[PDB]
Structure 1
Amino acid sequence: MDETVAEFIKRTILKIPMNELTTILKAWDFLSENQLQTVNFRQRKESVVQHLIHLCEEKRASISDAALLDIIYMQFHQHQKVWDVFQMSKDLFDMKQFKNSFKKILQRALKNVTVSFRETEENAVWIRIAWGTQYTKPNQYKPTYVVYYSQTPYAFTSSSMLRRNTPLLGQALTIASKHHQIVKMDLRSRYLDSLKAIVFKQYNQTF
């Protein structure tokens, strides 16, 4: 693996608290049960991380594997970002249809972008987008996270600056599922569970 992907995995593991480490890594399901047995987790973090980075080399970790561990960190630490709610207005054959559509729209608009996915059993997708330009590489340390619940008109994003790549994200989301318009709602929270609670409650009154 490249030193860029190796560094990203290092900084990701470094910010994981020690007690959580063994649970996140199992959830990641990239390093094997056998590989992880060789690691003793009861010393300095710096020793733990270099052993784990070695194990990623053995397993030939790509950027996609790195991006997936990052999603899992975020899934276990949703509170670290402020989530905005977005509403769409109006069928897919599949979730795979959405993922390929969405990925292409972004990677055609700009050339350098990392678009990764994780599916949860709620018919929901986590999207992680690391933005780059036509000329510059993707910034893996300032990514955008999207949580789209497929059978709803609702999508939840983590806004950091609300950049020039923010109208494009709306566009891509809107096009990739069978929707015509997107609008930002005036609903912010650090807690996604609490936002789900308001938008899916008032989605049940109207329909």
Structure 2
Amino acid sequence: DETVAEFIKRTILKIPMNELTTILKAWDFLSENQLQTVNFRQRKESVVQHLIHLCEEKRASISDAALLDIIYMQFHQHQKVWEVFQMSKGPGEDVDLFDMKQFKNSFKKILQRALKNVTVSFRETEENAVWIRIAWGTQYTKPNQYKPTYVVYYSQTPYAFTSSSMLRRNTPLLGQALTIASKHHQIVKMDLRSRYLDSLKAIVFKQYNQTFETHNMDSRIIHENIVEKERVQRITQETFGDYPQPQLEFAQYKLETKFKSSILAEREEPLRCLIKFSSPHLLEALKSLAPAGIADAPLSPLLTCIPNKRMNYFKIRD
């Protein structure tokens, strides 16, 4: 139909021209002999129109477009905000025997019996990763191809990543489907949201630190307070380590603590506050605060426990 062609055209237009050949090679839908016929030296619009002509000449379904969208999204994976989930199982359950076909069938059937019109697309890729693209819909509307939902699952692990696009009205349904298909008992949402998927992967699996130990100049200038400088350097090195820090860009704190300082001495109510830290590369600017003289030598634990406690949003009471 025309909707499929329009969706394919929009997807191709979204794809950059320099890496277009790689995307089409990875898609592996059109035959190889049909690729060299199109000249990529001309304008982008002419190439896009020619590819639309070729794909319309052949019988193209919506599955191919969904697979192309999945490939593009996993090649970019930085245009959306990702959230994490944690999954828990009973102590009396033995280790599960994971199977691809059973998981796919259960996940498809849960949504097919819950809703009526819904599109599901699967892609199994290396390091044991499963990408699921879901186009939502209901009984009285057709599935929407403009607001998809992306889910990344790791086999035999209690963690799953999701893209926060439109699931806010169907988040419990998605959680139930995930916890039923993979044979788990409870699902919870962790307070960890970020735009970089690799940083979340490193933090959740706590594999960001791989430093392992095994056996296998102007003397006329006098720097005073040198002992303080060496002490603060040692403290910073011990607290923040030496490994490259993961890349984060946001942190949020909520405070409900009392004010203690003559001033508001008789007040018995807390001082409600909300604080946001924003930076292109967090966890590295904070490392340079102590040497710059802006903060004290030992930083507050609320700022040096972001990767250890695996949280991004904090709430503090008295």
Q: Shorter chain as normaliser: what TM range?
A: over 0.9
Q: Deviations over 1:77-120 (max 9, x none)?
A: 10001110111111244112111211111122111111001111
Pair 1:96–1:203, CA change in 2 (3 A): farther
Which structure has more RCO (C-alpha within 8 Å, separation ≥ 6)? 1
- The structure in which a higher percent of residues are helix is 1
Pair 1:99–1:82, CA change in 2 (3 A): same
Q: Which residue of 1 aligns with 2:79?
A: 80
Cα drift, residue 151 of structure 1: 2.1
Q: Deviations over 1:30-56 (max 9, x none)?
A: 112111111111222221112112222
In 1, the alpha carbon distance for the partners of 2:173 and 2:4 equals: 26
Q: Report the secondary structure of 2:19's partner residue.
A: helix
TM-score, structure 2 normalization: 0.61
The answer to whether the 8 A contact 2:40-2:47 is kept is yes
Cα drift, residue 162 of structure 1: 4.1
The answer to whether the 8 A contact 2:119-2:134 is kept is yes
Q: Which ranges in structure 1 are unaligned for 5 or more consecutive residues?
A: none
The answer to whether the 8 A contact 2:119-2:143 is kept is yes
Paired residues in the alignment total 204
Q: Which residue of 1 aligns with 2:188?
A: 183
Among 116, 125, 140, the residue aligned to 2:121: 116
Among 183, 191, 197, the residue aligned to 2:202: 197
Q: Deviations over 1:118-152 (max 9, x none)?
A: 11111110000010111101110100000000121
Q: Which moved more, 1:158-167 or 1:176-185?
A: 158-167
TM-score, structure 1 normalization: 0.93
Pair 1:204–1:156, CA change in 2 (3 A): farther
The answer to whether the 8 A contact 1:92-1:177 is kept is no
The answer to whether the 8 A contact 1:92-1:178 is kept is no
The answer to whether the 8 A contact 2:7-2:65 is kept is yes
Pair 1:43–1:203, CA change in 2 (3 A): closer
Q: Compare CA radii of gyration and give the structure with the larger one.
A: 2
In 2, the alpha carbon distance for the partners of 1:118 and 1:201 equals: 26
Cα drift, residue 204 of structure 1: 11
The answer to whether the 8 A contact 1:123-1:151 is kept is no
Q: Which moved more, 1:78-87 or 1:104-113?
A: 104-113
